[PDB]
Amino acid sequence: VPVYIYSPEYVSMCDSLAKIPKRADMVHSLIEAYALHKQMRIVKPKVASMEEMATFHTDAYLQHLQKVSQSIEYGLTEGIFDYAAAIGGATITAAQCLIDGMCKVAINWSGGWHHAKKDEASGFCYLNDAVLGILRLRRKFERILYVDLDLHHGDGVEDAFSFTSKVMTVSLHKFSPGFFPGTGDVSDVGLGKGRYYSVNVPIQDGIQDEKYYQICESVLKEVYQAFNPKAVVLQLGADTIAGDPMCSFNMTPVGIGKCLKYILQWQLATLILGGGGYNLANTARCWTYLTGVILGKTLSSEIPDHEFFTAYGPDYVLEITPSCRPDRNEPHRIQQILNYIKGNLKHVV
Ligand SMILES: CC(C)[C@@H]1NC(=O)[C@]2(C)CSC(=N2)c2ccnc(c2)CNC(=O)C[C@@H](/C=C/CCS)NC1=O
Ligand SMILES: [K+]
Ligand SMILES: [K+]
Ligand SMILES: [Zn+2]
16 A cells, blocks of 8 residues: 655645745645545655765755755755755655555655755755665665656756666656756766666657657666666656646656556555646646556546635646647657667666
């Protein structure tokens, strides 16, 4: 039975981010309104300790994060340290449940902040809960696969494990000269002992469910065969979904859902995280849908009556319609990238 990291205090904390005001509450409330929470094991998140956060982040950055919470050299609000520790601890708790064998799937939709560096805040991320979750899972598992379906390149998580073969990072993202964070070209394969253990899939604007899954399934198939992971960490940023102010990819939660299904059928210990997603109603739509996918349940099309119903206009349905934007992804480029990745994975043995 899937573990659902939740507490009213945790949601309230996560809601205090200005860039995503009350998203955690909208995400939870929609899930609750579909009564999906009754089909999960609700686990209260623990707050991360200083030494747990120090497993990745430098002491100087942590001390400075705590100071500004009361320098632009660390990429830096008020109460931001408590915010970071709560999310970091939530992902660790979910990871710990995976270790304890309490579940095969642990969910933390408020986590997935993958841009944070060991000493730098970046892309609205103040603490890399993804890395902290992976480092906790490293206590039991020798091979961990990290899959990043955010619109942006998971540069923080990749750089964290760029020199190791214990963790492989797969990231599908928009890659363009000028687009944040600028890294993650297909040529990027990690460095040193961790060479070819970093997979990057540069994708252009306008991509939709069908072509996206064809890329994702193709990559994950040969990754699973070559790397053969013992645990999976899934980052599912909803800023790929149509309607997002980023306005890059043209995805629907159904396409992301199929990628999720293909991963879940591996039947491995899976850590589910959120991340990006700045159209709040659409983000709630996506993760609620994906939660239903995890539970193997089909959700009703009409948005249930709840606190944030008025935010789902003008359609007030769960399904999201792709935008009328053209697809900038040419078939030859994709195959040229796929074949290149396919060649890199052969070196993994
Ligand atoms: C307005 C827009 C540019 C927004 N920015 C901001 O709200 C602020 C806080 C105001 S100006 C600024 N940051 C900025 C200026 C120059 N360069 C960067 C940021 C590099 N960082 C990003 O582009 C992250 C990027 C978000 C990434 C989410 C990854 S899940 N942020 C933004 O889209
Ligand atoms: K990504
Ligand atoms: K790696
Ligand atoms: Zn993003």
